[PDB]
């Protein structure tokens, strides 16, 4: 499913040169580093030779050396010159590499996009028929960008990294004959261990994901049917299950965090030591008088630098593979030679053709459904001047006879000839432009009428095409509203109705001036007044040329002289027409109060001191490194050299292991805090959802899947927001502060240069990142110019190919992408110049800083070891700054978004319910009055309902309030439970207003049942007990309620009734019997009033007969209000008081015919 060594065949010779020079520049840039390392090695060796000052006789005679210092400064001048030379060279070569590679990539993307659009716009219609619309355009938008990114930047950096790797190792094979073995023999063990660590991390992550999916799904379930959940008032009983399931996740997350942090600590341990090992073997070799300090430094620094570089190339290869796959698909679309081309200059030129259409053995089936043969052979001959009307169920399925006229499909063994010439020999474009097509629905574009008319044929004059449009129904639908010209009719700007779209489409068809016309569903389901005029246009078009008309409406059939239509594929001649039956008819977060949510200071205070002590490691490493170098440079080689070297190596590991245990403690506290905050925030958010009520849940802005993602992939954001954003900044600031102060202790002047060179590099990196991010943000805006035409073109391809206007869309796409082409070229140049800029300033600052340090050493004040200490400390601190930032969990990625969204939803107040300020009368008479109650949908206030409803309810009432649709009557029964609120109306119950009737105790007495008995995955016995849950929970009444519900006879299968739960649709109950289970739950509620809305969703049949049996037993037992849009249900209701929107009272059907049907 991939392709390689083919993605660049569409590049020109200049592009090949571009790529070659880019590769050469990348190779040079890669080779740059090892040479610099070797220079540094020999340069430090020269220091060690000169700066030894071992003999006091030289130190006293002739003003110390004062001449060896001259040789030293000459050597330093030469070294600094060669530094700046290689820095300028790296500048130039890196600029060349990045710029040429990215510009060649841009040219390739331009060519690929143009060819892709041209090919996809040229395929046969069946290709789109076996495919969809939006997915293709999404592919077009995404894969081109993926290919660009890859075969630009990633392949650009890959050769650079690989050349760096071979370079350092070659320096290794020159100066590190044994250093290489220890360094490369320690390499596999360290990398492998971190990998065993990555594998364990992945396993723990998968376990955590599986564990959270159990509970998250309990969650998705309680939400899906949240209306029932709030109706039965089981929030207090339900949050407990949510919490236990959540708990079987936070301990797993604690384990996962422990694993990740101990893995990081182990990686540090494997690096500090072994790095330690290298010094251990190198220093001993220097003691053996065969190697020097520079010899060790060059190989050690070089081999490692290269290994990093070679390891850095993995994401580049991943992007390359993605680009390979995407290129494979997009090329697969390309070169897909269709059966019809419509572009090749081939075929005979028919002229003065009458248009005698023919049909002989016409067999065809749609490629989407080849199983059903749409047409099974027809024999027919027609003559020009006699329009033919087809009558039947449809146009042979869907306008099939029309489809083969313009070669939109390919006939199978059937031959059609307009004038005795087969369509295959006739040129496709010429055949298209001589036949006019009328669409069933006239899709147009948001553009002015002028180009809509010009889409017909090659425009000769604006006035001429206007005169062509001067046919009837003009000057009113084209001049009154559209201001006589230049009005972008469509969804964007002065949207019109189809009555004018059909007329302008017919006007375009007349601009075609066809030999033959085709009419398809002129006014299919249009307004009955919009017709009777468009048909006049069709008739006057008929007077010009012969047409084939297919429509469901029979009005045109009388007008048509020849009526040759049938159904089922059996041809019926046009001898007579009377035989056929005549149918009658989001701000940011505080970052100070968010963390204040974590009131776990005993779990939190450990980290800050731990973070500082962790950041304190790196400058200590720099000090130890400087001391190791000074042991051989400013050393004591007469007396003792082994003692201090071995002591420094021991310091190397004790420091490594203390950093390891520091990371252990830091993880053990920070991951635990993050996981406990995860569970805390989630448990709150769940109860916040519960107190939000139906109002917010009915808001379409929030959906069930979106809210499940809200509970899923936003707590991890706060996890990083807690520790990472604080631990990282504390570590970085501690490192920088302690490095700065130790540099000040060991440096009074050079630190000024260090603090002057660091900020320019920092701001250069920041401006580079900001510029690339801004260009990426703009890329969407300029690429949307392509989409503004591509979306409409792909959507309306049927009409587009039905029209002759093909190349114009390609030209507009070419221009609207050519502007982004220049934009991308300039962006490429900016990216290249800024990358070369930052690299060049890095090298040049290295050179200048080291040269001025050398000058100050020649001043005999700060000796080399101090210079190396300060330089390495500052630069490694800055390098660690960004590196530590990367190890964080996407704080840079959107995170504060989910953070403050969670804050907002948690701070959300309860609009209604879940409060103690409720008055609960002990017993209720049930005297409800739904009189003068008016209220609408808060979520959709555009549609007002529930106007002027007057009702009276008493004990024994059987109000069968039934009305048309559901928008006017469902809310009536939906208001008894106060899911919504009455603001214009007033509701009285027991002489008391409902707004303070102890909402929980209110829902307690309501036996409401939803229309669809949606049920969650609780055990059947526990599911039945869920009725009166959060109330007294008791045994030996569930069986009593089940028996009273007359359900025991069927459910006695597996009579245990306790563990026979529905295991994710396992042991599925009958579709109509779930509502029976709902009835049983309502009965075990022991209400005083019951509300029913089940109606008959499925084919309940005999099961339905049993459910109104249950209903009538329930209503003769206790007062029940039945709501159902079924005539049989109300006829079953003996107490016939049907009221619909309050026009009538009591039994309407007896008083008037209205309620009956
Ligand atoms: C604990 C802290 N480390 C990190 O925060 C860290 C995380 S990722 C990484 N570093 C990279 C990938 S690792 S390179 C490497 C090099 C050599 C060996 N070995 O087994 O001899 C192992 C490894 N390794 O850990 O994969 N390191 C380099 O790019 C690299 C190449 S030269 C070099 N550093 C210089 C000489 N040393 C340090 O800067 C240094 C000393 S303390 C320290 N860093
Ligand atoms: S004193 C200026 C500079 N400091 C940086 O922090 C810096 C800017 S860009 C950068 N570091 C990249 C991320 N560096 C490396 O990838 C890297 C790993 S090892 C290494 N560089 C060599 C040994 N050191 C430098 O190149 C260096 C010296 S000064 C400096 N960077």
Author numbering: 32 to 616, 689 to 1260
Source paper text:
For Pgp and ABC transporters in general, ATP binding, hydrolysis, and subsequent release of the cleaved products (inorganic phosphate and ADP) fuel large-scale conformational changes that ultimately result in translocation of substrates across the membrane bilayer. In conjunction with molecular dynamics simulations, our structures trace the substrate passage across the membrane and identify conformational changes in transmembrane helix 1 (TM1) as regulators of substrate transport.
L335C in transmembrane helix 6 (TM6) and V978C in TM12 are situated at symmetric positions on opposing TMD halves, while L971C is located two helical turns above V978. Based on the appearance of the yellow DNPT byproduct, Pgp335 and Pgp978 reacted with AAC-DNPT within minutes, while Pgp971 and Pgp302 did not. Importantly, Pgp335 and Pgp978 retain notably higher ATPase activity after crosslinking than the respective apo-Pgp mutants in the absence of substrate, suggesting that tethered AAC still acts as a substrate and that Pgp335 and Pgp978 cycle between IF and OF conformations. In IF conformations, TM1 is a long, straight helix. The non-crosslinked molecule is bound in a position that resembles the one previously reported in a crystal structure. It interacts closely with the covalently linked substrate, which is situated further up the membrane. Both ligand molecules are oriented along the vertical axis of the protein and positioned side-by-side through hydrophobic interactions. The uncleaved DNPT group of the non-crosslinked substrate is evident in the cryoEM density map.
